[PDB]
Design a protein around this ligand. Structure first.
Ligand SMILES: Nc1ncnc2c1ncn2[C@@H]1O[C@H](COP(=O)(O)OP(=O)(O)OP(O)(O)=S)[C@@H](O)[C@H]1O
Ligand SMILES: Nc1ncnc2c1ncn2[C@@H]1O[C@H](COP(=O)(O)OP(=O)(O)OP(O)(O)=S)[C@@H](O)[C@H]1O
Ligand SMILES: Nc1ncnc2c1ncn2[C@@H]1O[C@H](COP(=O)(O)OP(=O)(O)OP(O)(O)=S)[C@@H](O)[C@H]1O
Ligand SMILES: Nc1nc2c(ncn2[C@@H]2O[C@H](COP(=O)(O)OP(=O)(O)O)[C@@H](O)[C@H]2O)c(=O)[nH]1
Ligand SMILES: [Mg+2]
Ligand SMILES: [Mg+2]
Ligand SMILES: [Mg+2]
Lengths: 353, 332, 257, 307, 330, 315
DNA sequence: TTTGCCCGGA
DNA sequence: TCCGAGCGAA
DNA sequence: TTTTTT
């Protein structure tokens, strides 16, 4: 679409522009795709995993994979409650995010996916006999968000119907993927681009958009502030250009998102005042962040690594902080009410300082 | 042939094709003559041959034509609540066994019972498992149950008591190299000496993973189109193993002990996407088999690695857990 | 096949099955050369149904050796519904069978519909439960018994039957009050079907659960008269006569609190 | 007791049993001012005991004491009182009684404790333990209690852990911070905040599946990364250019299948220095009316008909 | 049933048919048999661990009381049946309050696996049990008393089925050997009894597997080697070798020894942990802290193993736990 | 069959009920002089609640018992519909009784009735009290809503003491010609824990088993209450003795790990001699082990570890 | 000492 | 177009 | 959707 992060997204394996060895591996997979195993792409956020999944699908099935439409599918729970799932589809593949339905994601696996596996499909645009002569492809986004029951429901579908269906699962971490599912997948590591690769991409955008640029070093700064997140770097470039009248300067500052600013303020507060009253104000800040769709795990990660950057703390404080972060990150994984665990972490940190 | 991923293409067809589970396969093969198959509980780690074994046994017992009428297979993809157990499963267990044809009777043992396979039974609720208990006993005359699981403690004690236990062992270079080499020869994959054993070492007990790794390596070699052998470095790259140089860098940063340096190095390291579990495994191997560290250090680090691996098993943030582990090692 | 039994019209068998469907779930049919007998017992083990169909109910019948077919009544009724009341219904079974074949065939066309219902391994004896000399034996039209039962069931969960010399008394006592119907024997040579007959050696007084009687009266569709046999120590026998055989309900009375 | 002394004594005269007025107060305390209950007590006791006085009032009061469940604010007040956690207080108000307090209202008690456990001046602090350290211990226990709570309401339905939950969520943290209240007992804020978060996640899902055909991200990445730039393409041009930015804003909205409702929702999401309410309130009504009029004057592409 | 009883699993082929074939529960059997003899049958509760003979005993009692036609004279319900409040109020209450269809006599209701019933159904049972005692008797069977209400427990006469002692298992094994024409060595019998934990089902299942594992069961003799082979379990010698290496050798040698012993027969780690715990329980330790550390750390390792995890790391954890705990011994 | 002794020797008159002397005396007074109040009888299992209400009703109403008593218990439907129709109609119905007598509604096991159903009873109780009186029996009196407690006389029964149980047992023993020794009856009382039902059941069991009621014959078939064993385990001074009790008296007798852990929780809760904060720490450890067992890891090692942690605490 | 969203219906 | 039921479901 | 009391 119109935003630069979308306008210039590559549409084929030939148009990819970072991590050349991974590109070669993907081309090798797409060379003879009839016995392609199920795939699991993993790597840090915003590096190009979905871009590469779409490029691989294009290499296998042609450009038609980018002609997408959305459709609403209905389901009913045992309690008779109605649920809807948005499904993205091309003529050659489906894309689902079962975690959209929360703990009911299992239903999506047990009914929708299974059905796709058991049926043949018609095709009156590529097949001479009206039937599609190819396996069906299903992309499962945010696969590490599936509950253990849904992941279990995948196991035998992947084996029994391998003739008719192939799965591509995408995740930012494999830690929550159960061992049987990883056993069934070809695991593809997708590393972040280097800062030079990011600078080259950003420079290409700067040229195609006629943005005035005092020095190339600016791009490097952006590349460094994005910590390998290419989506973040492209969006930051656009925002900086918009705020500097499409003319970036060496003095032009890096724009941080609102939630990051709030979290940094919270870090300064925790460091300055360790007391019960301060903890109550912190609870208010945490509720504000959570209510506006900042996930608890993101808050914990950002707060931990903001604290560890504070110059005034000593090694003992920092080691205590990282231990507490580990403990309460596990707590967040095992529990429901996030504010409880975030408050516990902040309280222990205040005690340690 | 050319349409199957190798894991499904080379699934054992009969009991003699299961490679390293003789202690259980022998018992099962004897029932082709004794015809008194007990209720079975297959348990063991992933990709060791449990599902393959039960399928091959049913084929050997009933022949291709009579199998379908003699089997009820229910797995984690199916609804298996207490109502299902009390109605569908019970009703199937109650039925008279399908009549075998004369040809079937000539060519197969045809025991006088049917089989209910509850694959992935460790995902069933305790109450549904309880509902299975008397159904298993009352209809043993015409029905035998086979529960399959990875975590035996998830099966309630009464059901474990009713079942005859078969533990499937981990598959490693010692006991699965023959099968892996057979597959490699069938597919015409050229490898250096050591590569197949290295695959099985990396797989860490899982033959499905080893076969998939072999297929990925052969795809790479065919794409390269140079006729060279697959190397161990290539296999390790495909398997997401951290290069030895990177691991040495980590070890030296830990040796230095500077918190900020470790933090910055870990932040850079995470950008490569290395799986934290593989990193922890490699650190365990490096430290526990190192003559330069003494007994107290190794005791403490063994507990540290255990704690971090346990926390990672719960689905935690890999960056946080890895940094905590490295800081703690550095302060030993 | 070993067993072949053809009903001229499937409606006969459907009505017979519907005559006792609501009381029991699993039924065991024994087919022999002289016809088909069947037994079933309700879930609470308080009611037993015994059916007899003679060879005269069938257009054609053949059973080379005795055979036992256990089945669930809901599945059987579901299948019976899939066929038409007008088609000819042939029950077919083979030696040591795993299923019973229901063959719906209409002579007008060449359309055959064959259903196979898998059988259960129901191993249970029938015991031919029938006491020799019942204390009291009575008979009356089915509609009147149905009416008495339906009226008295609105008052109490239990109904008492008292037989004494030349009098039959139904009684029900409940929360809003009580009801009592007394009938006497009577022969009407103009309309024998309305007759009420009573023979009795020992007077009897027994209590029964109302819901079971409400199920039992559903047999009235199969016969104009119902016979009732009662004894101090035995289950009560409610018999509805068919053109060829019979439908019997053996209902145990309540314990005298 | 004074408002009913005459009545009770008149009853004693009429029914011919000896009531000492001095014990009536205790009777009144026994039944918590329930006049029906005090009359019932006198009726029942006088059947065989024709004198109610100081020699029997104690055991009568014990036998007939009102054991009434408390309501949530009261449960929170009593659970956080420091008296019941001292040696003598614990002897008088037992651990079983505290767990019973949890069971008086087991859907609000954990929430009430978690709401109010920071709002005390504690009297139970151990020697050398500051208020903050006690609060941290309580917070740790509350987190563990949440884990237990998750297990109780799973598919396992492990109601047998309910007593454990009572200890982990309510009794133990309260025992750590019990004392006097430094203000009023407050209703839990978690319920309303959870409702608000649910609303905003619904809105985020809607915006995500409108923009799905154009972006490459999950919904979380939409909130963290995309929306800040959408704000500069959708709102800031209004500030810098009045009604001249209408067409450009409409062009972007069309590119991403966005409605006016999506515009409002998006602007609601921002926090901290990027809050928009006051900025938009300041925009002249002319610009808003022109925006709405131009938008309603044309057709707009749709991503999902009849969601 | 189908074909002969020789087609049945041994756990079902050897199910006791009469009270004289129930072993190792003599006090219970004597008491209940004389209850029947004198006509004094109270409401019974059979409480005990798996495979100790509860269902066998109650069914044998019904067979003795009612003869061969018992199955149509009792109401048997278990966890495979719905037993909600509605079932209690209709099916159970109707059977309790009504005479027998087939033969005159009192009614018997058997609630097997009663720990599977809800609180509401159990409470509904209270006055059904009390009101119809004159003509009906209830028998409740359970593995877990805590899911039974206090009111239900009060109304039943309790009988605890013990884990089967050594002598009873030995006699049952002798019967099985005679019937199967099997031979069993003394050490093999000791190993079998040790691994069964007093559960007869385990004994019979293992014995059937052992017979299947012989080449010629007529001449071949079941030795302890066969038992360990079919069970995939460690030999005691392996356990002692591992423990000695852990307690006396350096880390490299102990790691090597654990890995080599495990690789020898593909032993599981949890089995080694169980065996070593059993061995260490008999140690005399100077310091209670040694026992504390051992127990807590090994329990943590067992729990982590139950969820999967990294096997190598868990083995190293075991080695380190034992070494560190024994450091306290000084 | 012959009646079990528990039912054979159920009291039929109030003077045969032992224990709770003052309350039973009040009930006899009421039965003699009529004017029965609404009443709630509460207490522990098997101490004479149902017996007392039925005896009182029988003595009050004589031959009018059949028409003048409506009994409902947990085996009956008692929803809001029943309260609003059947009970209301029974309260409204005509019935001539002698002066001082009323119709009686017995609601046994009333603690299982829903709050709404209880609310529906308030005005029926108030409006028709000149002809109908209500008797509730329950185990947990706090489950009866306060408005209903307000309209009732509160009768809380206490557990039976060793002397009351001994007296009733001696009556039955003389009636049945049972041979016994003092140690045997003391063992019966010890294992009954104040529940008369259990005392009589175990007396019958011992007599049937071994004829003579002495301590050894009693303990051959009757188990010492495992809560007391668990208490002994929790109070042991050193870890080895506590583990020895766990091993010998609980684990090798066949008690399940879940039973052991839940009993440990219940007993620790009530250990009034251990300071409350220590009990809270112990409860935390017990709950950790309980959660592990519910996951399916209920082994002897887990219970031993629980004991070790409790020992670390109490040190 | 009781929140936020906002049902089904008018 | 207005209103808040009932539930916590982000 | 609800564990225990003395
Ligand atoms: N013992 C084995 N012999 C031969 N092939 C095996 C063996 N075990 C695993 N494999 C191979 O890996 C594939 C998977 O085997 P499975 O029997 O499905 O493993 P599994 O034990 O059922 O794994 P889980 O418990 O579902 S993760 C087979 O199709 C074979 O190709
Ligand atoms: N005391 C025993 N004597 C002889 N065989 C026994 C004995 N206990 C168990 N068995 C054997 O193990 C099998 C199962 O016995 P059951 O009586 O059904 O066990 P159970 O006590 O009911 O186990 P649960 O509580 O249902 S897990 C029997 O068929 C016998 O073969
Ligand atoms: N105080 C008592 N005096 C004599 N016998 C008693 C006494 N209490 C209980 N029993 C005996 O135990 C049996 C049961 O007594 P109940 O009155 O029904 O107990 P309960 O208090 O109603 O028990 P719950 O609350 O329903 S578990 C009686 O039939 C008597 O045989
Ligand atoms: N020029 C160029 N841009 C890329 C490449 N890979 C990713 N991108 C850009 O980076 C954006 C984020 O990539 P995405 O696949 O959504 O990240 P992920 O799925 O979270 O790993 C995309 O929208 C692209 O614009 C590449 O190889 N070359
Ligand atoms: Mg499998
Ligand atoms: Mg059993
Ligand atoms: Mg009672």
């Amino acid at each position: 679409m119109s935003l630069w992060v979308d306008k210039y997204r590559p549409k084929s394996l030939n148009a990819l522009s970072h991590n050349e060895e991974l590109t070669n591996f993907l081309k090798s997979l797409s060379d003879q795709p009839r016995d392609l195993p199920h795939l699991l792409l993993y790597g840090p956020n915003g590096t190009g995993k979905k871009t590469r999944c779409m490029a691989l699908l294009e290499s296998i099935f042609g450009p038609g994979v980018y002609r997408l439409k959305i459709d609403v599918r209905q389901f009913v729970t045992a309690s008779n409650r109605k649920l809807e799932l948005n499904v993205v589809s091309s003529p050659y593949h489906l894309e689902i995010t079962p975690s959209d339905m929360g703990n009911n994601d299992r239903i999506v696996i047990q009914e929708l996916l299974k059905e796709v596996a058991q049926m043949e499909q018609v095709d009156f645009q590529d097949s001479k006999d009206g039937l599609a002569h190819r396996y069906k492809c299903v992309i499962i986004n945010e696969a590490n968000s599936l509950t253990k029951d849904a992941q279990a429901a995948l196991r035998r579908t992947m084996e029994k119907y391998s003739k008719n269906i192939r799965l591509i699962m995408v995740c930012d971490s494999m830690s929550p993927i159960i061992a049987p599912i990883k056993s069934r997948c070809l695991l593809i590591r997708c590393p972040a681009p280097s800062d030079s690769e990011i600078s080259t991409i950003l420079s290409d955008v700067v040229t195609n958009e006629r943005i005035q640029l005092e020095t190339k070093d600016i791009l490097k700064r952006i590349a460094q502030a994005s910590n390998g997140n290419l989506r973040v770097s492209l969006l930051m470039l656009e925002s900086m250009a918009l705020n500097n009248e499409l003319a970036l300067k060496s003095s032009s500052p890096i724009i941080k998102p609102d939630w990051i600013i709030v979290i940094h303020k919270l870090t300064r507060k925790i460091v300055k005042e360790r007391s019960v009253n301060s903890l109550i104000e912190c609870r208010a800040v945490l509720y504000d962040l959570l209510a506006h769709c900042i996930p608890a795990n993101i808050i914990l990660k950002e707060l931990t690594f903001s604290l560890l950057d504070v110059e005034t703390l000593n090694t003992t404080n920092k080691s205590s902080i990282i231990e507490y972060s580990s403990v309460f990150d596990e707590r967040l994984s095992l529990g429901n009410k996030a504010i409880f665990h975030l408050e516990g972490f902040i309280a222990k940190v205040m005690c340690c300082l | 042939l050319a349409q199957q991923p190798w894991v499904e293409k080379y699934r054992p067809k009969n009991l003699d094709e299961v490679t390293a589970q003789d202690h259980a396969v022998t018992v099962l093969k004897k029932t082709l003559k004794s015809a008194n198959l007990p209720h079975m509980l297959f348990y063991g780690p992933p990709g060791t041959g449990k599902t393959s074994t039960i399928l091959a046994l049913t084929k050997e017992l009933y022949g291709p034509d009579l199998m379908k009428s003699r089997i009820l297979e229910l797995n984690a993809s199916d609804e298996r609540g207490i109502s299902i157990v009390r109605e569908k499963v019970k009703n199937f267990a109650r039925l008279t066994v399908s009549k075998p044809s004369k040809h079937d009777l000539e060519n197969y043992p045809c025991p006088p019972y049917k089989i209910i396979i509850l694959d992935e039974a460790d995902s069933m609720t305790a109450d549904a498992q309880s509902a299975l208990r008397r159904t298993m006993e009352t209809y043993s005359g015409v029905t035998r149950f086979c529960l399959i699981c990875n975590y035996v403690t998830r099966i309630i004690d009464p059901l474990a008591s009713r079942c005859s236990k078969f533990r499937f062992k981990a598959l490693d270079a010692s006991n699965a190299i023959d099968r892996l080499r057979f597959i490699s020869e069938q597919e015409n994959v050229k490898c250096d000496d050591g590569v197949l054993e290295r695959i099985l070492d990396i797989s860490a007990g899982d033959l499905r993973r080893g076969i998939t790794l072999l297929q990925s390596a052969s795809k790479g070699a065919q794409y390269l189109g140079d006729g060279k052998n697959i190397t161990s470095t290539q296999v390790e790259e495909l398997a997401g193993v951290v290069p030895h140089d990177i691991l040495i860098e980590i070890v030296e940063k830990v040796k230095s002990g500077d918190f900020d340096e470790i933090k910055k190095y870990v932040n850079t390291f995470m950008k490569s996407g290395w799986s934290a579990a593989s990193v922890v495994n490699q650190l365990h191997e490096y430290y526990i088999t190192n003559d330069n560290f003494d007994t107290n250090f190794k005791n403490q680090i063994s507990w540290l690695l255990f704690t971090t691996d346990s926390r990672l098993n719960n689905g935690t943030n890999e960056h946080i857990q890895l940094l905590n582990l490295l800081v703690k090692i550095s302060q030993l | 096949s070993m067993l072949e039994a053809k009903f001229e019209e499937a409606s006969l068998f459907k009505r017979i099955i519907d005559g006792f469907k609501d009381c029991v779930q699993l039924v065991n049919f024994q087919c022999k050369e002289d016809g088909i007998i069947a037994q079933a017992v309700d879930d609470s083990r308080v009611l037993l149904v015994s059916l007899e169909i003679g060879v005269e109910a069938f257009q054609e019948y053949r059973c080379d050796h005795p055979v036992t077919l256990g089945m669930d009544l809901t599945s059987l009724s579901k299948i019976l519904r899939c066929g038409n009341n007008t088609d000819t219904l042939t029950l077919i079974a083979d030696n040591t069978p795993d299923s019973i074949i229901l063959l719906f065939e209409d002579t007008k066309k060449d359309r055959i519909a064959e259903y196979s219902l898998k059988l259960m391994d129901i191993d249970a004896d029938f015991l031919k439960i029938e006491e020799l000399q019942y204390d009291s034996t009575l008979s009356l039209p089915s509609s009147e018994f149905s009416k008495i039962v339906r009226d008295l069931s609105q008052l109490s969960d239990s109904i008492n039957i008292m037989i004494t010399k030349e009098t039959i008394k139904f009684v029900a006592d409940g929360d809003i009050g009580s009801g009592s119907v007394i009938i006497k024997p009577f022969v009407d040579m103009e309309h024998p079907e309305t007759s009420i007959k009573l023979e009795m050696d020992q007077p009897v007084d027994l209590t029964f659960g109302a819901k079971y009687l409400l199920d039992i009266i559903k047999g009235s569709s199969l016969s104009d008269r119902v016979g009732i046999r009662l004894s101090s120590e035995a289950p009560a026998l409610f018999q509805f006569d068919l053109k060829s055989g019979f439908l019997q309900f053996f209902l145990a009375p309540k314990f005298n609190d | 007791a004074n408002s009913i002394k005459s009545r009770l004594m008149t009853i004693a005269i009429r029914e011919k049993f000896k009531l000492d007025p001095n014990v009536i107060d205790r009777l009144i305390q026994t039944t918590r001012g329930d006049i029906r209950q005090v009359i019932n007590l006198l009726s029942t006791i006088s059947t065989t005991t024709k004198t109610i006085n100081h020699e029997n009032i104690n055991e009568i009061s014990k036998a007939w004491e009102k054991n009434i469940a408390l309501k949530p604010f009261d449960i929170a007040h009593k659970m956080l009182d420091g008296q019941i956690y001292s040696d003598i207080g614990s002897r008088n108000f037992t651990l079983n009684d505290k767990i019973a307090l949890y069971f008086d209202d087991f859907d609000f008690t954990p929430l009430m404790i978690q709401e109010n456990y920071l709002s005390t001046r504690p009297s139970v602090l151990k020697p050398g333990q500051s208020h903050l350290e006690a609060v941290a211990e309580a917070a740790n226990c509350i987190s563990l209690g949440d884990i237990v709570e998750k297990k109780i309401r799973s598919s396992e339905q492990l109601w047998s852990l309910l007593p454990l939950h009572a200890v982990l969520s309510s009794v133990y943290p309260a025992s750590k911070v019990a004392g006097h209240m430094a203000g009023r007992i407050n209703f839990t804020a978690w319920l309303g905040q959870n409702s608000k978060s649910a609303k905003y996640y619904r809105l985020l899902q809607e915006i995500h599946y409108h923009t799905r055909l154009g972006t490459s991200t999950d919904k979380i990445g939409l909130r963290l990364d995309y929306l800040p730039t959408f704000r500069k393409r959708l709102l800031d041009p209004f500030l810098k250019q009045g009604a001249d930015a209408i067409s450009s804003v409409i062009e972007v909205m069309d590119d991403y299948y966005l409605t006016k409702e999506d515009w409002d929702s998006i602007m609601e999401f921002f926090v901290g220095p990027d809050v928009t309410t006051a900025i938009i309130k300041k925009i002249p009504a002319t610009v808003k009316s022109g925006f709405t009029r131009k938008y309603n004057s044309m057709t707009h592409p749709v991503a999902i008909y009849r969601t | 049933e189908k074909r002969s009883k020789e087609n049945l699993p041994w756990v079902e082929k050897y199910r006791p048919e009469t009270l004289d074939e129930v072993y190792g529960q003599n006090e219970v059997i004597t008491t209940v048999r004389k209850f029947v003899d004198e006509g004094k049958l109270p409401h019974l509760l059979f409480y005990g661990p798996p495979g100790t003979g509860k269902t066998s005993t109650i069914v044998a009692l019904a067979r003795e009381i009612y003869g061969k036609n018992y199955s149509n004279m009792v109401l048997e319900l278990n966890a495979s049946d719905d037993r909600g409040i509605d079932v209690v109020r209709n099916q159970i209450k109707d059977f309790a309050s009504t005479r027998q269809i087939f033969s005159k006599g009192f009614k018997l209701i058997i609630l097997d696996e009663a720990d599977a019933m809800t609180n509401a159904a159990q409470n509904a049972l209270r006055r059904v049990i009390e009101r119809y005692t004159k003509n009906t008797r209830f028998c409740v069977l359970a593995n877990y008393a805590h899911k039974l209400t206090p009111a239900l427990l009060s109304r039943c006469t309790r009988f605890r089925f013990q884990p089967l002692p050594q002598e009873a298992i030995e006699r049952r094994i002798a019967n099985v050997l005679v019937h199967e024409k099997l031979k069993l060595s003394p050490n093999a019998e000791k190993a079998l009894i040790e691994l069964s934990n007093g559960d007869m089902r385990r004994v019979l299942n293992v014995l059937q597997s052992c017979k299947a594992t012989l080449d010629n069961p007529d001449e071949d003799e079941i030795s302890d080697d066969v038992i360990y082979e079919c069970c995939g379990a460690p030999r005691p010698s392996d356990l002692k070798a591992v423990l000695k290496s852990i307690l006396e050798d350096d880390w490299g040698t102990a790691h090597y020894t654990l890995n080599k012993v495990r690789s020898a027969k593909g032993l599981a780690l949890i089995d080694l942990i169980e065996g070593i715990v059993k061995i260490l329980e008999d140690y005399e330790l100077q310091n209670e802290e040694t026992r504390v550390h051992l127990l807590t750390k090994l329990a943590d390792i067992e729990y982590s193993i139950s969820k999967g995890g990294n096997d190598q790391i868990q083995g190293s954890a075991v080695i380190g736990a034992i070494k560190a705990s024994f450091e306290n011994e000084t | 069959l012959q009646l079990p002794w528990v039912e054979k020797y159920r009291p039929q008159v109030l003077s045969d009920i032992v224990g709770n002397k003052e309350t039973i005396d009040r009930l006899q007074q009421i039965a003699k002089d009529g004017n029965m109040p609404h009443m709630i009888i509460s207490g522990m299992p098997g101490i004479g609640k149902t017996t007392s209400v039925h005896c009182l009703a029988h003595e009050l109403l004589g031959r009018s018992y059949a028409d003048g008593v409506l009994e409902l218990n947990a085996s009956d439907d008692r929803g809001i519909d029943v309260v609003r129709n059947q009970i209301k109609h029974f309260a409204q119905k005509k019935l001539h009784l002698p002066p001082g007598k009323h119709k009686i509604v017995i609601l046994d096991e009333a603690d299982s009735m829903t709050a709404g159903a209880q609310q529906a009873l308030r005005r029926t109780m108030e409006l028709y009290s000149n002809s109908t009186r209500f008797a509730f029996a329950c185990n947990q009196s706090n489950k009866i809503i306060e408005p209903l407690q307000s309209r009732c006389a509160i009768l809380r029964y206490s557990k039976l003491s060793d002397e009351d149980v001994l007296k009733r047992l001696l009556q039955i023993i003389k009636l049945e010609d049972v041979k016994y020794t003092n140690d045997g009856l003391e063992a019966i009382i010890f294992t009954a824990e104040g529940d008369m039902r259990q005392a009589i059941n175990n007396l019958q069991s011992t007599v049937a088993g071994h004829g003579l009621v002495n301590a050894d014959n009693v303990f051959k078939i009757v188990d010492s209450p495992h809560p007391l064993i668990v208490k002994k385990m929790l109070l042991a001074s050193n870890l080895e003795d506590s583990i020895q009790i766990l091993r010998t008296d609980l684990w090798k007798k066949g008690y399940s790990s879940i039973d052991i852990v839940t009993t440990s929780f219940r007993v620790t809760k009530n250990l009034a001699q251990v300071k409350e904060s220590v009990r809270l720490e112990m409860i935390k450890e017990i709950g950790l082990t309980h959660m592990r067992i519910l996951e399916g890891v209920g082994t002897y090692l887990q219970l031993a570890s629980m004991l070790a942690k409790i020992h670390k605490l109490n040190n």
